Amino acid sequence: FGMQRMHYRNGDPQTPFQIAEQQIQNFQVANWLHFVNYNQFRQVVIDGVLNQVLNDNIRNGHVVNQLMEALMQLSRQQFPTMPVDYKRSIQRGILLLSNRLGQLVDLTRLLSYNYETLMACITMNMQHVQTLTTEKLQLTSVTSLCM
Amino acid sequence: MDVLYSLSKTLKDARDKIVEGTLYSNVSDLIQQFNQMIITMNGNEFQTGGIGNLPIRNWNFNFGLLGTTLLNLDANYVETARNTIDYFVDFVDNVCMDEMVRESQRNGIAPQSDSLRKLSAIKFKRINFDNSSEYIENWNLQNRRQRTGFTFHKPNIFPYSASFTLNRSQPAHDNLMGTMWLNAGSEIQVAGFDYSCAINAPANIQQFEHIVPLRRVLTTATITLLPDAERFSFPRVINSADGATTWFFNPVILRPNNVEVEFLLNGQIINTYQARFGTIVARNFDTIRLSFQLMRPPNMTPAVAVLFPNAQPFEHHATVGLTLRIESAVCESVLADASETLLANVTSVRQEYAIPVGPVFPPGMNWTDLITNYSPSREDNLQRVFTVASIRSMLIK
Amino acid sequence: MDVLYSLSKTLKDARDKIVEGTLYSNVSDLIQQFNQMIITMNGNEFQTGGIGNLPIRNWNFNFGLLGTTLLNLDANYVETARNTIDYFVDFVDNVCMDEMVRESQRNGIAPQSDSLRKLSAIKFKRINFDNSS
Amino acid sequence: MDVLYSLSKTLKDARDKIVEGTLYSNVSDLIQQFNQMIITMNGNEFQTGGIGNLPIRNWNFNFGLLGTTLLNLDANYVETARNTIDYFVDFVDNVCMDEMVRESQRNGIAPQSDSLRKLSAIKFKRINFDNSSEYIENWNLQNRRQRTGFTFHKPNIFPYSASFTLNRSQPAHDNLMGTMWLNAGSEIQVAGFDYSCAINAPANIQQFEHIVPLRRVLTTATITLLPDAERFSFPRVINSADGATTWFFNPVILRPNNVEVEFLLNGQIINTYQARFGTIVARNFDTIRLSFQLMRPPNMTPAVAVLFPNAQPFEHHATVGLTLRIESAVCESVLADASETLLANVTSVRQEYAIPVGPVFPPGMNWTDLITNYSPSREDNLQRVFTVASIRSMLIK
Amino acid sequence: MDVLYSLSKTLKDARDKIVEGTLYSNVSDLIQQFNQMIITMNGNEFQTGGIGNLPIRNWNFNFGLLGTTLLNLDANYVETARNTIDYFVDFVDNVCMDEMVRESQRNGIAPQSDSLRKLSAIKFKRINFDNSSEYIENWNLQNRRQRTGFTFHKPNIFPYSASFTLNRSQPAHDNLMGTMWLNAGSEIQVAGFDYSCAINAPANIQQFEHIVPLRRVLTTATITLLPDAERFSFPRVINSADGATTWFFNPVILRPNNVEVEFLLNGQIINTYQARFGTIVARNFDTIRLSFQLMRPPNMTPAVAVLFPNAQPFEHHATVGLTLRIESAVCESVLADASETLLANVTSVRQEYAIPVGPVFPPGMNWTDLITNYSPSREDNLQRVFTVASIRSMLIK
Amino acid sequence: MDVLYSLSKTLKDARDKIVEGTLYSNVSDLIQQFNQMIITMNGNEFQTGGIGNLPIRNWNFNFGLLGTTLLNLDANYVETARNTIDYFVDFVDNVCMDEMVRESQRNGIAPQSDSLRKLSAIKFKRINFDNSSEYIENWNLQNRRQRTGFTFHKPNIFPYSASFTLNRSQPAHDNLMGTMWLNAGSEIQVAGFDYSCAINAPANIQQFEHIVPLRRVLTTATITLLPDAERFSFPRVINSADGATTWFFNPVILRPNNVEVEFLLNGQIINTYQARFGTIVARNFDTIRLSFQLMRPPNMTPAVAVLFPNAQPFEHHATVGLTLRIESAVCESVLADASETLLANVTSVRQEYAIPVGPVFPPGMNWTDLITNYSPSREDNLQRVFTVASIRSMLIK
């Protein structure tokens, strides 16, 4: 949108999605930036077991219908000051993903079901706390899952 | 304003649908609305009250979402949601009382309180829910300039008025002629009298007329017409016009002859009815014109003929009257009626917190003084306050 | 007769539930009804009025479906639906005034106007919605 | 309606900005608007006229785009555009005359002609341009229910009225008392008289009063008040009330004593001025209440004392008057005034084409008959026709 | 002429849009016009003045272009442009005063000064900018023979005239009949009198008439008509026709009976109004014909009957008058009015520099002498000078 | 001050140019201005009100930019911009009412409110837009000491005054001489009288004179001169100088002989006119000097000769008067007039919020008291408040 890049001053309670939300007056993008930051688990018991669950819109693939619109919206942003060589390579790389709507609506429809079915067999509480070490994710593996 | 109704609609449904033991699929779409209320409202802070004896309270929202993982709701899930609903329903009471108490003269249709001005941002528009009530539907149709309509049962369209008119008089007050009337609520009782009983009138017929103009245009009314004024039927003593002396009125009652009721709109006769009593309709009108006449009976038994002599001492005075009553009608502006209590909720808030007299409304919210001079500046304020009083009635009776 | 109530029930709910900024899951079942109205009504043509001073109007339905892909409804989605509702709500006024004005003596419980006799086919029965009044 | 103003705005600018020799960057954004008019309008066909003597014409649009490749415009580029503008400006004249001539009674704010109903589709909405005029800005603010305002210079708010009132009379007409007035345009001249010159009044003071109600509420007026009615100052003979006889009025003029002018709104005193002449203001009012009194002078020279005897023959009658005049005010409904010619354009079209009398407007567009009964059904028609007359005045004077 | 307006339009916009701190995209198209002024004007040299006391000045243009590389304008960019604007705005003042002061009789619509003849070459045509003012738009429509129109508020269409006419007279001057009038500005006050009060007239009715021809044809006028001439209402002494003796006029005033106002065009009745006062319209006319009559009142009280005897001594003379006033109208030639000051700018230049009387205009620019003989040779000069005075009013008030 | 006009100019254009369906190139330069407003205004916070009954409000700006990527604007783009404009246009109303209500005596041309002092930093100077209005152009020319000018229609230059002067008197009040006048608004009506009708004057000629000084220097006026004072033409009774007794004045009216009107500037005669009625001009003046004389007519018919005897009882008094009226003029200081409503907006704010009397302006903003003592300390305050009232009139009528 031609905005100036921001500095974060690594300290606030506000994530970069949370700052970039009331900064943009676009409906198609700020509908998506409002889901993604208030996207968290829900703490509630069944049968004596406290478990962590999610929204309805991830349990079906309905939130991906907004990720389409928002990603598609900016696939036409003329990108001011950007060189047109690097501009066309990044606007076409988004349509690698936005043109796959029906296959990602069903992928997050399957991911939520396998998480839902396997958590029936949990006996201890699903207590949530930040672990000292961390299992590492590579975003190369996510692009390999999506495409 | 549209998001203040949308807060109250899904707090009413949250106390009704989230009950113990119910199936989860019954409330699967309400919880997606109720969680999306909370996400919008967190982090904000509000302030209500300050005028009169209405106390100042500060509001702050930091709540957690509801669980979406049970099959049947249990008593843990109900009791953890009731202590969230009870904080919101206390917030909406103090915003609705903050708005029914304030008024402006330039543009009364705009929000006046500090909290309702802050809720009118585009940040809070995602709380918007269905608008199915009568007053919030007419709030939206009238905001786009489309035709609206409110349905009333016995609407208070007439201001209180009880007076008379003497078309023939003298200081002795023993040979009089004219009409008397009572206009109050939704009922007209007019009665014409003549002491001589048309002994010297041409063809022994005396003509009467009574014209009542309205303040707003009514549509599709159901009107009951009966040929007697029961209020002007007994002997009474009445003061003079300037309160100097008193005069006596001893009636006997004939039947009304040649009755014509007309229903006018910009001087054009829309409907007319000639000697037709009972229930009648009136499709579009703003002026009622009653017409009726007294006729001396040409044949009289000896018990009747003593009552009406030719000479001056008239001890039994002739009287002819009618009675009209509006049962139900459809207007376009807000009014008061006999079924709903929206006027009583507005005055009870102002009387309780000792609110000073402002620039628009009459002192004490007097309905006789408010329908008498029913200006377009008072109409925009009265709709804005009856609509807020309708939102508060869903949560707190 | 049963499908004339079912046209008016989901035009009343369409002006109430399809508002700006609302969540899509609030209106996810109304739009499946409102799209399925339009599919049944396209290609047909009607004619109301003719008695007294009631004027003769001709009706023709060629509309497009509504979108089912947003998360929160915006002002494009509302303003493209209001100019479809306002044509149907003008059609139902002129069918209801055409029927309140006519009468018969043999069997008065049957429909009398030309448009309401045509709506009583089994082609139009899929518009049927709840009957709660 | 919004796209009818947008056709006339960019035909006015096309005759002004597309001139010979001008630089191309001066008109680089107008040509993108003017080409995008043509693309929307091609293939359509229209029909205007049909009522009265207004002839029927058929319109058909098949034009080509303008060139966007010169640096300075030459005489080929101007002369190929003038023969496209001259066809559109003839089309807009016949749509504006087709709409100023028609009227309705149910909903007068809707378009009535066949061409303007067809221009209100969403196909034609891309012709929409800026809305910067006074009447098209108040057309849009009032369509969303926001507060509007029209600024007038000497507004025709008073209907024509010239009459009198006798508070004391006899058939000889030689000892009279009362007021006389002229209300016309934006000027009030009231004058009170007393033939006896308060010789038997209590404390030799006679009280007068004159109350003028308005039809619409005015805002922020500038009013000139002068202590003489120059029209009721000379000897004249006046007929009686029922036209039976005539009576004579020979004035001499004292100064007005104890003048109070009040400016009412729903019976509440907004402003008041006591013995203050010159220029005054009035921020919000709908009723003017003039009050002034005659006082017999206690000391008189011998030339004055002969004029006012104690006995019955009064040959010189006392007179006290005022004069009020509204210079400029701000109303919310449309009116007529002394600066702009929007009323004159409407009547001149109806008189030229011999248009029959319809259901709403008075015969001959009589302004005295139209401001007397200024109903809300006539207000919606009068705004719809003054706004179309304002669009036509940009192209064709 | 078209390029003299185009110099003043982009010097007015250069002082308004080139301000400190503004964004560059607000002025990105003005600077391309202002730089392209300078390129055309460099190398040329001019000479103004020479007539009367107007001094001779020589003009020479050697300036540099403006920078087109900032994002927000700073105080260096403003102060380097103000010392270029202030030399051009001094040049345009001395060309406009050089043209308002000169006149010709053969073809007055051509430029007369030496500088404006030199600006009419095709070298200078690229300075041409938009022509959006009222006088420069009517300069171009009338130059191609298309229909124009100027809108006025109270136009000075009547020359000053105050006289009378005696239809019955004798050297004693005690039994007279006729009319009196004042025509001045945009107002007609005519009053007819009869000393005998129609005692010997047939059916006691005396007919009056007053016909006023105009100089130019007016269109869509708004006219106020009131039934009293307040100027001919008091006792006065008037000289005779040849200034020999004086005669006395003591009026009493009846109401005007049977009033008919007609609006003629080439002898054809366009509009007519019969006993209709207040505001009226007149769509197309060039001659006003007033008609009104005096009627002796058939019934008179004893106070009235003494005023009008049968014999010769008439001490109270009857008088009937009218009053007409044009509020606003649309003409096609230029005139003077009450709102704009274009006549005052022309005479103030000629009076200041002591300019000799030329062949066309009256001495001292007398408007009464100029509208009396308003020849087509004076019309072409008067439009050429009011248009130059309108260009100078944009820069220098 | 310059940035307060620049906020209101691009909020007026944002409601006019950002409409539904318009092409993006029509608004491509406004959005670059409107986005650059928002960037400057974010993070700041303001506070208005506090004096009188004007409430205290706090302002806080945290908004997002507008999109710059569409080809035709849709209803999402309009409705997301209207809820940003409606917060700014509420902010500018409360800054303009905060400044029209305050005043100072040392340097009134400086900003007085807390918000307008904060907007005068160099941080806020990048919001500056074009300055094309009349009052903001004269605000900038006068701030650099260049010559300014305001154009008025009937300017209120004369304070209200109605009095007389007796050059010959006695306690009987039957042989008097002097002048009477009314100066009110923009109109002078002077009338001189002589009871003896110059029977003993040298050469039977009585000389009159009336000198009116102005408060500010007017330039290029258009003046109408008519040879009758219609206000001093009827019989009236007038009090004495100290209010002791009353005296009688019964006029008959001759024509004014040898009229000379002079237009002075520092005692120098700029213009003069001798027996020339109708419309006249006056290029530069600050003092009007009227001169006229009464001449006894040498020849009289027998109806006239009875009116003027040689002895003492004079029952018909001679009267000679004039009438002057300024139609339009150009001043350099601000004034009030009959066309624009800038005085009415200032007083209506002060009357509504019950503002106490400060050190500069008269109580109640009385224009007769303000033009009487029109000091240079009041001139700097009156220009500062009329300019703020002109900014508020663009957004809120």
Ligand SMILES: [Zn+2]
């Ligand atoms: Zn005027």
